[PDB]
């Protein structure tokens, strides 16, 4: 699981609360993304009804603030390529000795990321050294995906 800042939430209440209700302190869907569009993100048109249905469901007719943000990261987990790498390397980074070969990563990071290129690899390679064995590991390389 990835950690998040508590001050961005101060950004999360800036919007939700602008639409804040008198009851449990909830809001609707059309204007909730205005909470999602504020941090530098944006939600889908059909998901506001379903994922919000996971937190705005209980029989109120709207969305509350507490769990609406907890699910917010699941949405950034919907467009997160870094959450997929940990998953892929189990297919390419275990061909023997346990350290993935320098030639697989470019096929791995590229396998998860559509925008992410080989230059992403060659950029992290310089730090990996690669020379001597010609290959690299998972804890040293992909770990640079979590750091960079």
From Swiss-Prot:
Q: What is its subcellular localisation?
A: Cytoplasm, Cytoskeleton, Spindle; Cytoplasm, Cytoskeleton, Spindle pole; Cytoplasm, Cytoskeleton, Microtubule organizing center, Centrosome; Cell projection, Cilium, Flagellum
For this protein, the parts annotated as crossing the membrane are none
The GO cellular component terms are: calcium channel complex; calyx of Held; catalytic complex; centrosome; cytoplasm; cytosol; extracellular region; myelin sheath
Tell me what happens on changing residue 141 to L: In LQT14; reduction in calcium affinity; not changed protein abundance; not changed structure; significantly decreased thermal stability in presence of calcium; no effect on RYR2 interaction; significantly reduced ryanodine-sensitive calcium-release channel activity; impaired negative regulation of high voltage-gated calcium channel activity; impaired regulation of cardiac muscle cell action potential and
Binding of Ca(2+) 4, residues: 129, 131, 133, 135, 140
What information about domains appears in the record's comments? The N-terminal and C-terminal lobes of CALM bind to the C-terminus of KCNQ1 in a clamp-like conformation. Binding of CALM C-terminus to KCNQ1 is calcium-independent but is essential for assembly of the structure. Binding of CALM N-terminus to KCNQ1 is calcium-dependent and regulates electrophysiological activity of the channel. The C-lobe interacts with KCNN4 channels in a calcium-independent manner, whereas the N-lobe interacts with the S4-S5 linker of KCNN4 in a calcium-dependent manner playing a role as calcium sensor and gating the channel.
The family database entries (Gene3D superfamilies) matched by this protein are listed as: EF-hand
What stretch or stretches form a coiled coil here? none
Q: How is its activity regulated?
A: (Microbial infection) Inactivated by S.flexneri OspC1 and OspC3 proteins, which specifically bind the apo-form of calmodulin, thereby preventing calcium-binding and activity.
Q: What is this protein called?
A: Calmodulin-1
Gene responsible for this protein: CALM1
Q: What does the annotation give as the result of altering residue 97 to S?
A: In CPVT4; the mutant has significantly reduced calcium affinity compared to wild-type; calmodulin-RYR2 interaction is defective at low intracellular Ca(2+) concentrations and restored at moderate to high Ca(2+) concentrations; increased RYR2 calcium-release channel activity; decreased KCNN2 calcium-activated potassium channel activity; not changed KCNN2 expression; not changed KCNN2 location at membrane
Name the source organism.
Homo sapiens
């Amino acid at each position: 699981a990835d950690q998040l800042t508590e001050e961005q939430i101060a950004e999360f209440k800036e919007a939700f609360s602008l639409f804040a209700k008198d009851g449990d302190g909830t809001i609707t869907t059309k204007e909730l993304g205005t909470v999602m569009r504020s941090l530098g993100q944006n939600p889908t048109e059909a998901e506001l009804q379903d994922m919000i249905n996971e937190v705005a469901a209980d029989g109120n007719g709207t969305i509350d603030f507490p769990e609406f943000l907890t699910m917010m990261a699941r949405k950034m987990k919907d467009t997160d390529s870094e959450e997929e790498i940990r998953e892929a390397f189990r297919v390419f980074a275990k061909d023997g000795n346990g350290y993935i070969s320098a030639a697989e990563l470019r096929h791995v990071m590229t396998n998860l990321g559509e925008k992410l290129t080989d230059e992403e690899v060659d950029e992290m390679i310089r730090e990996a050294a690669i020379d001597g064995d010609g290959q690299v590991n998972y804890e040293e390389f992909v770990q640079m995906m979590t750091a960079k």
